[PDB]
Amino acid sequence: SIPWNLERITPPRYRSLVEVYLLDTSIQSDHREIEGRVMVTDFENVPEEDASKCDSHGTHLAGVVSGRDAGVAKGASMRSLRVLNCQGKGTVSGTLIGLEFIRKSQLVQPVGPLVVLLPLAGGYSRVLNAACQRLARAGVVLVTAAGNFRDDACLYSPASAPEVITVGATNAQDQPVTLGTLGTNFGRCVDLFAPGEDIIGASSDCSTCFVSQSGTSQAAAHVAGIAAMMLSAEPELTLAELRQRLIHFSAKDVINEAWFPEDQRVLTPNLVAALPPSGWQLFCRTVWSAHSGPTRMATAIARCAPDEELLSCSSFSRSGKRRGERMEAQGGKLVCRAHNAFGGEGVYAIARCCLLPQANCSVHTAPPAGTRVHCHQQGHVLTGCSSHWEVEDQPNQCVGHREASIHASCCHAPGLECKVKEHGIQEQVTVACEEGWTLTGCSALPSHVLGAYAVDNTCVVRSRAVTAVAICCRSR
Amino acid sequence: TATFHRCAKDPWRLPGTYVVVLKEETHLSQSERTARRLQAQAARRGYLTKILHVFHGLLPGFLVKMSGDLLELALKLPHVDYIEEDSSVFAQ
């Protein structure tokens, strides 16, 4: 009796002050699933066309989010804006106006936390991304479709907007939806996946009908309902706190990554959304750069969100022709920068981004001689090690080869306990933090390392006599 | 300093309508003035314009329906940050 998708997101233990806005087609607001809980707004901005069709898409999604019988957040108050016409087409400009409309309604009649579901995509849009970013700065939570083109999400908007939660689609077998040349978008702009194929929900065909639809919007609607419920339970969550918790509570490594193109496999988060089980914990996430160009001086950058701290920095290139990485200040924030090498096709920079208030952090460098630095005090903790070089070919202390410069991430956080865990043996070596601990830094001890990156709480080092080093922390 | 952007996926482009985005501190009264300024200038060249919407709240700026020939003119207007040609979004 329970739809696979509602079951898939239920955690191992389980049992209206939030509003979810919906920008979509028209809504049959008096369908049984959503009747009385959806308010049609008086906003409409659609391009001209070139009655059951017209409200099918929006009706199904409102259903997935808030439906009495088949919905994720069954007790969810919703508000609809019409921005897609009957063929499901809208404009960037009409969407802007709708998003503007939301902020205005907020200013003139505030309620509680707002979630905005954006079940649509066009190509990368500068202005649409910017609008989303401001709406996020204003304290609003945005959830969007990764897009349906079996392509890189960074090429689509609002999917590419960094401040918005971008959601890809998985099927009943937990695999990325594929269909011919179409299917879920993927890549580094995707934050997580959710059920998005064969999804039961309200059909606009009649007041009591249900239909099965599929799309990254359906995947996105699941995340919006989960977010609605997370915010009902803890309304003071900021976006950044909310995003980290979605990642933390997702199922991990249930996606077979061979479904993605080779070069997107490490970039694409292996996460299928789930409701959290129902005092303070250390949350971290890994942020990947776009691939740099193949020029020598090409570099890649990875950044954290405004309220996150960059706790460690690594790099990777599948040929291994790279010159490592370094943490450098930029606009007041630590940023992680990776270096390409001569003959190298380009490299990735890989950041570990965490929610750690009550903390100041700095980078400590020693130049080549191997080479060492440390965090020179107590209750001030080493969270990450980076290493870069100009050539081509120990508690609280980082060490790297003698021809390399070396960098330590040092944080003031006396509430934190950290331990360094090593393991070595050979294409790949991994070491994981024990349960309750959070991976803050991942590196390789100085054979030939392609690179290293954190995957959830597991440090991965790729090689072609190799040891992986994990820094692990928790609150005490 | 003012840049122009149109969608890289050609079939999704919607030429003829443009989102003009002004610098961040720009007050609504200036946004509207600047829209009227552009209208004036375009009229002196026998181009017809229609200001569809003036934005304030998230971004300052306005929505304009006008020939692309005026883009160079529009880009010289005081306060302009960048201009983006409208384009399509689709149900996902």
Binding site: H57, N148, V211, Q213, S214, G215 | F90, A91
Partner: peptide, 10 residues
């Protein structure tokens, strides 16, 4: 009905 053509571009 699975991938309704109501979703772009299924």
């Amino acid at each position: 009905x699975x991938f309704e053509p109501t979703t772009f571009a299924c």
